[PDB]
Amino acid sequence: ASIPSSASVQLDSYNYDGSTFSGKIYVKNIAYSKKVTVVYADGSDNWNNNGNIIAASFSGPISGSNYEYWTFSASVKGIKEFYIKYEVSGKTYYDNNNSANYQVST
Numbered sequence: 472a473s474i475p476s477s478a479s480v481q482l483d484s485y486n487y488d489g490s491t492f493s494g495k496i497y498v499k500n501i502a503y504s505k506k507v508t509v510v511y512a513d514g515s516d517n518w519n520n521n522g523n524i525i526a527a528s529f530s531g532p533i534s535g536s537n538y539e540y541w542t543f544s545a546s547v548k549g550i551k552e553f554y555i556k557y558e559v560s561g562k563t564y565y566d567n568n569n570s571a572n573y574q575v576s577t
């Protein structure tokens with residue numbers, strides 16, 4: 472994925488080897504204090520009231536743009552799909568892959 476044009480948060484890429492779920496995320500540097508979480512459905516596509524979460528952390532700047540990189544990695548029992556949540560300055564933004572969410576393979 473290329474840098475987003477206006478979205479506040481947008482997955483860049485993700486990886487899954489059947490045990491470890493990891494990835495890189497584009498985050499618009501709106502304010503200093505940020506919270507970026509990855510919310511997923513389990514091997515049984517159960518969301519658990521948005522309770523299966525992975526906290527992402529600052530990874531590094533992106534020269535010449537108003538975005539920066541955040542990464543995440545975690546072992547998960549199983550996963551069917553996921554979306555990203557971004558909280559900053561009292562507002563909440565999301566990356567739900569045009570409301571289809573990101574579907575994971577195997």
Ligand SMILES: OC[C@H]1O[C@@H]2O[C@H]3[C@H](O)[C@@H](O)[C@@H](O[C@H]4[C@H](O)[C@@H](O)[C@@H](O[C@H]5[C@H](O)[C@@H](O)[C@@H](O[C@H]6[C@H](O)[C@@H](O)[C@@H](O[C@H]7[C@H](O)[C@@H](O)[C@@H](O[C@H]8[C@H](O)[C@@H](O)[C@@H](O[C@H]1[C@H](O)[C@H]2O)O[C@@H]8CO)O[C@@H]7CO)O[C@@H]6CO)O[C@@H]5CO)O[C@@H]4CO)O[C@@H]3CO
Pocket residue numbers: 500502503504505506529539
């Ligand atoms: O005393 C320092 C500081 O202490 C407290 O802040 C803590 C905070 O409460 C915790 O949440 C945590 O902060 C984490 C943060 O929430 C995460 O989002 C992430 O932050 C990364 C950013 O996402 C990323 O963008 C980058 O940050 C760069 C900024 O975007 C860029 O603007 C610039 O920052 C400058 C500030 O804009 C400017 O105001 C000035 O900052 C000073 C503050 O004004 C002053 O209040 C104080 O800050 C307190 C804070 O209020 C407490 O709550 O001192 C600041 C001086 O350092 O100057 C900044 C220039 O340095 O540049 C930064 C890059 O440096 O990277 C960050 C970090 O990777 O992760 C955060 C850390 O986990 O922890 C902090 C304490 O470390």
Ligand SMILES: [Zn+2]
Pocket residue numbers: 472473483484
């Ligand atoms: Zn990309």
